[PDB]
Amino acid sequence: GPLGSARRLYVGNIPFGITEEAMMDFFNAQMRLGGLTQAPGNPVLAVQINQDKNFAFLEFRSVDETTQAMAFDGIIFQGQSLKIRRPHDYQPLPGAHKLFIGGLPNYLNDDQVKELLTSFGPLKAFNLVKDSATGLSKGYAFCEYVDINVTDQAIAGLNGMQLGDKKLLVQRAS
Amino acid sequence: GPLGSARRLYVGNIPFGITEEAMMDFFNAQMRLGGLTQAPGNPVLAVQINQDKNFAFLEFRSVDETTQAMAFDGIIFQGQSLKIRRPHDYQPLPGAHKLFIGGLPNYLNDDQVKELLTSFGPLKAFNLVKDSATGLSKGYAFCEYVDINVTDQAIAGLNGMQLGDKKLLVQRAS
């Protein structure tokens, strides 16, 4: 559900034949050296490795230290650049990464506006604000990407873009 | 596999008439004497002797204790200095010849993908990546050949191969 999977991370591309204990020791050391722990001790409680598919799950003692550890994405461990991700069944709460899109040409419809946005990735929410009487577009919209990592990319990619005789505004909605 | 040979050592210059049990007793005793063991018990599980060519293979219970026993090069057994080496198929970088196979038609099952691969020789490791929910192939796999020398010829043969709808990508998984 909404609050599940908040103290685990997926780690891909792990070193061949690495032990769970060695991985645990590596991450606990890095958490401490990097200043990512929030209290004395080791944030990583356990590592479960799938050897056949070469990935691991890390289990953390707290929700906030799990979040901090996302910063280790790409860290080199015994020659391998580790891939660090959220569990697939972890999700931010609804609207956490809502985008406002303003300055759209009023004659474009829903599908036409989404075409610009979905070029960065799939959307879990979208609405183009329209005058409810006439049904006409007011030239601004909101959306949310399925993958919340995409949010900063769409902003970097679309904000301030020239579009007709307007500059697009794309920013986090709150 | 890439570790099966990480637990063996070559022993050369063995005295005439030596038995496998006497060889095993000698190395276990040497291991314990040098304090090179990382657990109670005997690190050497078995020895196989070729009396005709005066060499033997030692099989160890662990990768680290095998590495420790490299220090025994030159050791005196029945008056003779023993030659100790890695097996020729030893892999200093484990997993260096693991392959990634991408662009597989997504209806192909395990056996079918393997049949594509084994025309170059036998595999010691294989896995086709599937969605755990549906059981459906994600369209890529990993393998490793029994004989690593086959690897590049497999890449030469399979990389870029047209496979119905798709084109294969075969490369070291790195």
Chain B hits for A17, CB-CB cut-off 8 Å, are 2-3, 63, 94-95
- Note whether A160 and A76 are same-domain residues: no
3 state DSSP class of A53: coil
- Distance separating alpha carbons of residues B76 and B74, to the nearest angstrom: 6
Contact across the interface for B63 and A16, Cβ inside 8 Å: no
User: What domain count does chain B have?
Assistant: 2
Contact criterion met (CB < 8 Å) for A53 and B127: yes
Are residue A69 and residue A113 in the same domain, yes or no?
no
Method: X-ray
Please name the residue that has the structure tokens 């929700």: A63
Same domain, B29 and B108: no
Residue A76 shares a structural domain with residue A131 = no
- In angstroms, what is the resolution? 2.0
* Sign of the CA dihedral with A33 first, then A36, A42, and A47 last: negative
Task: Give the number of other Cβ atoms within 10 Å of residue B99's Cβ.
Answer: 23
Range of the domain at B173: 1-92+149-174
**CA B7/CA B66 separation, integer angstroms:** 6
Q: Which residues pair with residue A85 across a beta bridge?
A: A10
Asked whether residue B100 falls in the same domain as residue B71, the answer is no
Query: With contacts defined as CB-CB under 8 Å, which chain A residues touch B94?
Result: 16-17
CB A35 within 8 A of CB A72: no
Q: What is the 3-state secondary structure (H, E, C) of B13-33?
A: CCCCCCCHHHHHHHHHHHHHH
Q: What's the number of CA atoms in the CB half-sphere (13 Å) around residue B97?
A: 21
Half-sphere exposure of B99 (CA within 13 A, CB side): 30
Domain boundary pick from A93, A126, A156: A93
CA–CA dist A150, A28 (Å, integer): 29
Which of B3, B127, B129 faces A17 most closely, judged by CB atoms? B3
d(CA B109, CA B136): 9
Enumerate the residues of chain B whose CB falls inside 8 A of the CB of residue A52. 127
Helix or strand holding residue B58 (H, E)? strand B55-60
Instruction: Determine contact: B1 vs chain A, CB below 8 A.
Output: no
User: Could you tell me if B102 and B83 lie in one domain?
Assistant: no
With an 8 Å Cβ cutoff, is A17 touching chain B?
Answer: yes
From A15, A46, A17, A41, select the one nearest A29 (Cα to Cα): A41
Nearest CB neighbour to B2, from listed A16, A52, A53 = A16
> Is residue B64 domain-shared with residue B51, that is, in the same domain?
yes
DSSP letters spanning B60-106: ES-HHHHHHHGGGTT-EETTEEPEEE--TT--SSTTTT-EEEE---T
Question: Any CB–CB contact under 8 A between B93 and chain A?
Answer: yes
Q: How far is Cα B20 from Cα B50, in angstroms, rounded to an integer?
A: 10
Give the CATH number for residue B120: 3.30.70.330
3-state secondary structure (DSSP) of residue B15: coil
* DSSP characters over A85-149: E--TT--PPTTTT-EEEE---TT--HHHHHHHHHTTS-EEEEEEEE-TTT--EEEEEEEEESSTT
Residues B9 and B80 in one domain: yes
Q: Which residue has the tokens 């890529």?
A: B140
The Cα A104–Cα A161 span in angstroms is 11
The closest alpha carbon to A38, from A6, A5, A7, A64, belongs to: A64
| CA A2 to mean position of chain CA atoms | 16
- Interchain contact B87–A (C-beta under 8 A): no
Same domain, B144 and B162: no
Task: Look at residues A93, A117, A132 and tell me which one is the last residue of a structural domain.
Answer: A93
Same domain, A132 and A51: no
Residue carrying the six token digits 């393998």: B143
Q: Based on the domain organization, do A104 and A39 belong to the same domain?
A: no
Q: Are residues A128 and A84 in the same domain?
A: no
